[PDB]
């Protein structure tokens, strides 16, 4: 009844939190990479420049923050 | 009534799950591509810090 759908809600809500956690983990790795890159934009290495290209690439439903 | 509006919340949550997986895949993909560049240029303190970044582990995560 209610108890069955609420079971689904309960389970889904925790999935949402596991996914947020997982997304925050990956997104933080990129923010750290982007700090290391900004922090060596004086060295002019194209290898770090290859990495900045990747960082800033968009896809469907993803925009540059403004 | 209540079963109508819980089905509604279940549906909403299914979309949130999909959106988060989409968001997560996007970010994991960037990290693999970056890992890819790194595992071509083994042999410099910077790219090894980037690899140190990628490989850092937290509770709930295992290096595969």
């Amino acid at each position: 009844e209610a108890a069955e759908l609420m079971q689904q809600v309960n389970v889904l809500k925790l999935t949402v939190e596991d996914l947020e956690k997982e997304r925050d983990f990956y997104f933080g790795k990129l923010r750290n990479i982007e700090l290391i890159c900004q922090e060596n934009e004086g060295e002019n290495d194209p290898v770090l420049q290859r990495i900045v290209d990747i960082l800033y690439a968009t896809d469907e439903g993803f925009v540059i923050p403004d | 009534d209540e079963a109508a509006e819980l089905m509604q919340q279940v549906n909403v949550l299914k979309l949130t799950v999909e959106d988060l997986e989409k968001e997560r895949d996007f970010y994991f993909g960037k990290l693999r591509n970056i890992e890819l560049i790194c595992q071509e240029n083994e042999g410099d303190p910077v790219l090894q810090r980037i690899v140190d970044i990628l490989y850092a582990t937290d509770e709930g995560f295992v290096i595969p």
């Binding site: 923010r31 982007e34 925009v63 923050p65 | 959106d19």
Partner: peptide, 11 residues
Amino acid sequence: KPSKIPTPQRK
């Protein structure tokens, strides 16, 4: 300083 990493757009 501010991050330029693509984030999800609003709906």
